[PDB]
Design a binder for this molecule. Sequence first.
Ligand SMILES: COc1nccnc1CC(C)C
Ligand SMILES: [Cl-]
Length: 157
Amino acid sequence: EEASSTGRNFNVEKINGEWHTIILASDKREKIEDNGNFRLFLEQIHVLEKSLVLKFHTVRDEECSELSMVADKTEKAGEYSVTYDGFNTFTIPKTDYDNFLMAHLINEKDGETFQLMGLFGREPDLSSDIKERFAQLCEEHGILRENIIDLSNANRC
Ligand SMILES: COc1nccnc1CC(C)C
Ligand SMILES: [Cl-]
């Protein structure tokens, strides 16, 4: 079964646990390139009553830096907000809970904005078919494939 965080049948408890960043995509590519602040490697999602605790790490000169963020539910069901390199809101347009999770995030900083999309997997990689479904979701948001970066061979410290 699959669901969207904005959907009626969404079960947030089921996204709790281990996750890995498989692919990141953005209409401002610099944000996810080397040293971009959004080149984030997810490790875990802890589901709480009204928030999600996100554990990530970034990498600089082959050195891993841990970071934790708390995302709070907003007034729209399935949407969360979090302060990080600006103000962010995000939703999960599609997840099957057991294998993949696709997220769409809007960042706003210094009066600007950009879209960030992410494909996260329970294991350190996902099938080529799920990677293709993710490229199609990115296309529905106006994000070109050339702005989609597979990080499955760069997600372990
Ligand atoms: C694009 O998705 C994201 N990107 C950066 C930070 N958080 C998210 C939300 C996910 C982890 C649910
Ligand atoms: Cl489509």
